[PDB]
Amino acid sequence: NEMSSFLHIGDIVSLYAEGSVNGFISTLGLVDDRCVVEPAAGDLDNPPKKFRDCLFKVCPMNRYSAQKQYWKAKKIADVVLLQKLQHAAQMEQKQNDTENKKVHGDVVKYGSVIQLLHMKSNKYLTVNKRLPALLEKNAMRVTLDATGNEGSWLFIQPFWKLRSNGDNVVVGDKVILNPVNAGQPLHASNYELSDNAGCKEVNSVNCNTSWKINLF
């Protein structure tokens, strides 16, 4: 009765929320960038249909400073500068590919930063501190983004007493996902989507939501 396994970078997992509502965090398609929880869809004892759409891959923290610099950048000296920034952004993207490969399989520790890549849409969960959530106006917006950015960084923190910063995250653990930039944990709200009955908005705001991480 003591068996268990650790969460590793590269693992494919589902995240089951227990906050304002309970349920797996899922999506609405390959285009829609909203994240939701459909409590009635299913639970841990009875998984929803097309459960594959609830899967995310645990990824390392990517570099995004050069990419951001290039965006802001959007006279010959300026055209050259722009080309230089474009190249720096490309090199950064290549650096992430290279460096992320080196940490594949590494154990995920509490206190570390991770990114969650939605498998089906191939987009990262992202929290935008400068944009209010769609439904719960006091919260910050959570969306799926193909390239991801600084808003994709998430601290995986202890939810239970027995876990401390630096401990390995154990499969089955209930954890707190706290976006690095936003500053408030991922929240499973009870705000119903008007165009998708039964689906609740996932956002970022001061809350007590826990996320149970399970392998597939």
Curated annotation (Swiss-Prot):
Q: How is it modified after translation?
A: Phosphorylated by AKT1 on serine and/or threonine residues.
**Which residues does the UniProt record annotate as the domain MIR?**
105-165, 166-216
Q: Where in the cell is it found?
A: Endoplasmic reticulum membrane; Cytoplasmic vesicle, Secretory vesicle membrane
Q: Superkingdom of this entry's organism? A: Eukaryota
- State whether it acts alone or in a complex, and with which partners, per the record: Homodimer. Homotetramer. Interacts with TRPC1, TRPC3, TRPC4. Interacts with TRPV4. Interacts with SIGMAR1. Found in a complex with AKT1 and PML; this interaction modulates IP3R3-phosphorylation and in turn ITPR3-dependent calcium release. Interacts with IRAG2 (via coiled-coil domain). Interacts with CABP1. Interacts with TMBIM4/LFG4. Interacts with CEMIP. Interacts with TESPA1. Interacts with TMEM203. Interacts with BOK; regulates ITPR3 expression. Interacts with BCL2L10. Interacts with CHGA and CHGB.
The entry sums up its family as follows: Belongs to the InsP3 receptor family.
User: What's the domain remark here?
Assistant: Composed of a large N-terminal cytoplasmic domain (CD) followed by a juxtamembrane domain (JD) and a transmembrane domain (TMD).
User: Main role?
Assistant: Inositol 1,4,5-trisphosphate-gated calcium channel that, upon 1D-myo-inositol 1,4,5-trisphosphate binding, transports calcium from the endoplasmic reticulum lumen to cytoplasm, thus releasing the intracellular calcium and therefore participates in cellular calcium ion homeostasis.
> Which protein are we looking at?
Inositol 1,4,5-trisphosphate-gated calcium channel ITPR3
Corresponding gene? Itpr3
First and last residues shown, out of full length? 2 to 224 of 2670
